[PDB]
Write an enzyme that holds these catalytic residues in place. Structure first.
Site, PDB file in Angstrom:
ATOM      1  CD  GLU A  68       2.798  -7.745  -5.808  1.00 19.15           C
ATOM      2  OE1 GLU A  68       3.777  -8.247  -5.393  1.00 19.15           O
ATOM      3  OE2 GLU A  68       2.180  -6.904  -5.145  1.00 19.15           O
ATOM      4  CE  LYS A 100     -11.481  -8.229 -23.885  1.00 16.51           C
ATOM      5  NZ  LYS A 100     -10.720  -7.044 -23.876  1.00 16.51           N
ATOM      6  N   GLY A 115       0.663  -1.196  -0.099  1.00 15.57           N
ATOM      7  CA  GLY A 115      -0.102   0.061   0.029  1.00 15.57           C
ATOM      8  C   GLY A 115       0.820   1.010   0.012  1.00 15.57           C
ATOM      9  CG  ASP A 171     -16.654  -9.485 -22.635  1.00 17.43           C
ATOM     10  OD1 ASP A 171     -17.232 -10.611 -22.005  1.00 17.43           O
ATOM     11  OD2 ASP A 171     -16.542  -8.476 -21.888  1.00 17.43           O
ATOM     12  CG  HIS A 192       5.582  -5.123  -4.516  1.00 13.80           C
ATOM     13  ND1 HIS A 192       4.123  -4.894  -4.272  1.00 13.80           N
ATOM     14  CD2 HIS A 192       6.244  -3.857  -3.979  1.00 13.80           C
ATOM     15  CE1 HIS A 192       4.232  -3.768  -3.389  1.00 13.80           C
ATOM     16  NE2 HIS A 192       5.239  -3.323  -3.560  1.00 13.80           N
ATOM     17  CB  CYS A 220       5.417  -3.980   0.857  1.00 11.55           C
ATOM     18  SG  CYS A 220       6.692  -4.503  -0.659  1.00 11.55           S
ATOM     19  CE1 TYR A 221       0.221   0.482   5.616  1.00 10.17           C
ATOM     20  CE2 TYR A 221      -1.304  -1.431   5.739  1.00 10.17           C
ATOM     21  CZ  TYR A 221      -0.857  -0.440   6.281  1.00 10.17           C
ATOM     22  OH  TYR A 221      -1.808   0.225   6.900  1.00 10.17           O
TER      23      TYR A 221
END
Ligand SMILES: O=c1[nH]c(=O)c2[nH+]cn([C@@H]3O[C@H](COP(=O)(O)O)[C@@H](O)[C@H]3O)c2[nH]1
Ligand SMILES: O=c1[nH]c(=O)c2[nH+]cn([C@@H]3O[C@H](COP(=O)(O)O)[C@@H](O)[C@H]3O)c2[nH]1
Lengths: 475, 467
Positions: B166, B335, B51, B221, B164, B78-79
């Site tokens: 990710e 998606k 964050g 979609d 991170h 992290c946070y």
């Protein structure tokens, strides 16, 4: 002095430039020109260029029959080789189509080809074929499709090549031209010191005690012309018209260097005049009309006030010869010291005249300056934006050593909110040009810095169009 | 199902997506959610995102303490690693400034770094710092300037990382997240067939025997939604509104594939309507407004002329979530996951792997007012760009490609980007030789285009579309 007989080839000027890059003076003359004419200049050798028409086409130019009976060493290129063949007892026949093509010489021998070992790629002309060289001549070259790509007389005085050695597609063409010069025993007098010696001599005798008037733009041509007058010690006045359409910092850089080098310089502040005159004008042709008109006005006003001036020096170059308007009452005798030189030869003279690289190596910039780089009305705000973007582009190009790697670079402001177009090209003759393929990482950096430091610019693009089909400038 | 507790990180949605890529379902919840709400979904593991605000910031989001005493495997990022510290005895102090940075882990041990041998570059958060782990934990990771890069509980069910995992800047991050899932004993139920089954069932029940109306645009979609209905035997009316602002042959490709698949399709010719309605208008805003107004008008009319339609099916997606009853069977998917279902539903690659195309179509790609002539010029240029991209095998290497027509006489701007989320985007570094081929083919085959340009601008600062 090597004479280039022009039979229409798009590479004629190129032939003449290559000769000079081999320190031999070259002059161009139309192919169908009286023998007395081609000889009045004492040619040390002759070169017959190619041409877009077949030697069978009646409209195609023909040389003076006597030409081949002068004893002058000569080289025939494509059309030139074929003229030489039929005109001397050889046999030429129709074949292929008027087009070029890369080809490897499967055989290349004799003095015309020494130094050329390994693959020798040539830019062959596919229009017709000599099938038989003049009686007694030797076929010194072949490709897979053509058993006679080059011919030579038994005395080594005349040669013919079915390809263009003056073109990049014949990478080793210069050596071939160099062999020809060595063969014809052509003296290499075309050196910069020789040119300088002659121009100073000339300019001094002609100018005399009189005063010369000259316009200075910042370009290397007029700058070198100014330096020539000063170094020659002829009385003169160089006039720099600041139309307020120059690049950021251009006026100061130019005025400082020329004055330091000794030219009598006069700067005219006509920024307000030009901007006013340009209000509400979008048509690029009109902008040029107006710019040209305001310029001749401010320049004539200076000429009258500081006159009289017996001579008007101009930077006319050889390409101009081979192909604004002052008030009728202003009569001048023309002084054109660079009329037989190419642009790059003037840059060389500038070196001997003491012009610093800061100005000697800068890229060409147009008379109407930034006015032709804003798509639409020219306003002070738009110029301030374009000046900034242009400055950042030029500086990054210099920082990454890319500036000297393109013939010209420029930025174009397009009102939408603004979209800036980066544009750089490579060229020799400015008449055909390819878009410059600058590194993608460099383009990213140029775009981030511009939109970063010039927030009025919201998008940056790079022009991918060559010439043909498009011009270098956007208008 | 793994839960992601959102503490504000701009990478929160990324964490969710990675987990899915690891065949685990994932959902996002505010970091300050009630423990009761957090547990009703019966998560197998929890992940505390990072964050922007410091753990000392009072306005910063706080989790439910009890959450740390729930017996669930968790990973604090992290946070998140900070919270994990202080809330359990460890020490966390102010440090540096809210910013990230690449750093090599000087040491990485434990089942959390299983398989990550050689060098391990991580994207470190420089906002504060754990100076002392909770009593009993092991600092299983370090970096040059930071002695505590990662911490592990003694029970090996909780972990914290000061980087991170990710983001692409943590190259081996996916492997760390995979290791944590293995440790957590997370089951991988997130597969396409499970999704399809679940979705066919629902759609079927929710709609029963009523009438459901959905609009097909051409996008994978809308198309997949249409195929889902049909496959579920649901009674529907797929409405394709040709506004005359589509790409060459797009309409024929869509109706032919959808009909051939079994979709009850009705295409409405509104070319004229949209064209006339757009005359003289240049404002990008007005165009979209006008286009939208005209589409509703056209859609509404078919809703009546063929009504009644109890349900209005829409292709709402999870990122979106992040006189009609709405039926949105994809609100929990990304998606790319819908493209994956479209495969199981038998949609051909021709329409299944196409880049997105805006509702306003080529109207937003004409710098100025739209006209039939300008549209024809653009359509042919756009077609050539697409074809060359496909022929060179580059089409699939970019997220989106488009051409903009700038009336000057026309200058055409080629534009391609690479993106994860369309919410950030980099201009695509297409080969120089390729752009040359594209520029020449265009000016040669489309004579009214005198100049071709390539967009070098990323997002930010610019939008993908020019308007
Ligand atoms: O002195 C000038 N006055 C002009 O009006 C002008 N217009 C184009 N140029 C320059 O000429 C070269 C070719 O530009 P184009 O391909 O657009 O004709 C390029 O080097 C251009 O910068 C000009 N120079
Ligand atoms: O359905 C749509 N209707 C629209 O009006 C619209 N405008 C932009 N886009 C698409 O959204 C993504 C981001 O485009 P921007 O960075 O220019 O906003 C890109 O993928 C764009 O193509 C639209 N899609």
């Amino acid at each position: 002095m090597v004479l280039v007989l022009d039979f229409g080839s798009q590479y004629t000027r190129l032939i003449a430039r290559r000769l000079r890059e081999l320190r031999a003076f070259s002059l161009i003359l139309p192919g169908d020109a009286p023998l007395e004419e081609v000889l009045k200049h004492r040619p040390q050798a002759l070169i017959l260029s190619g041409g877009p028409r077949s030697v069978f086409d009646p409209d195609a130019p023909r040389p003076d029959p006597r030409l081949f009976s002068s004893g002058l060493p000569l080289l025939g290129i494509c059309y030139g080789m074929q003229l030489l063949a039929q005109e001397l007892g050889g046999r030429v026949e129709r074949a292929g189509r008027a087009e070029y093509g890369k080809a490897l010489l499967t055989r290349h021998e004799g003095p015309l080809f020494r130094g050329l070992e390994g693959e020798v790629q040539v830019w062959m002309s596919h229009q017709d074929a000599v099938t038989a060289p003049p009686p007694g001549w030797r076929v010194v070259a072949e490709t897979e499709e053509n058993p006679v790509a080059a011919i030579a007389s038994p005395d080594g005085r005349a040669y013919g090549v079915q390809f263009h050695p003056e073109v990049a597609h014949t990478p080793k063409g210069m050596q071939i031209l160099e062999n020809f010069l060595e063969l014809a025993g052509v003296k290499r007098d075309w050196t910069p010191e020789h040119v300088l010696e002659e121009l100073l001599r000339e300019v001094r005798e002609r100018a005399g005690k009189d005063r010369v008037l000259l316009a200075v733009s910042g370009g290397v041509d007029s700058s070198t012309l100014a330096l020539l007058l000063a170094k020659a010690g002829v009385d003169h006045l160089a006039v720099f018209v600041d139309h307020g359409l120059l690049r950021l910092g251009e006026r100061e850089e130019v005025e400082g260097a020329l004055r330091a080098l000794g030219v009598n310089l006069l700067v005219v502040d006509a920024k307000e005049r030009f901007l006013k005159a340009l209000k509400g004008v979008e048509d690029p042709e009109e902008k040029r009309k107006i710019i040209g008109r305001e310029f001749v006005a401010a320049f004539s006003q200076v000429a009258r006030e500081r006159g009289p001036f017996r001579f008007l020096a101009q930077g006319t170059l050889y390409p101009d010869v081979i192909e604004g308007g002052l008030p009728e009452d202003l009569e001048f005798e023309l002084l054109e010291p660079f009329r037989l030189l190419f642009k790059d030869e003037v840059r060389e003279l500038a070196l001997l005249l003491g012009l610093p690289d800061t100005l000697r190596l800068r890229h060409p910039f147009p008379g109407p300056g930034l006015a032709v780089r804003v798509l639409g009305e020219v306003t002070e705000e738009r110029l301030e934006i374009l000046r900034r973007a242009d400055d950042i582009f030029t500086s990054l190009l210099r920082e990454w050593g890319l500036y000297e790697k393109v013939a010209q670079a420029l930025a174009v402001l397009t009102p939408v909110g603004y979209v800036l177009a980066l544009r750089a090209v490579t060229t020799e003759d400015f008449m055909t040009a390819d878009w410059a393929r600058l590194p993608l990482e460099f383009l990213d950096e140029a775009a981030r810095r511009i939109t970063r430091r010039v927030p009025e610019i919201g998008r940056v693009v790079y022009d991918l169009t060559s010439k043909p089909p498009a011009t270098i400038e956007w208008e």
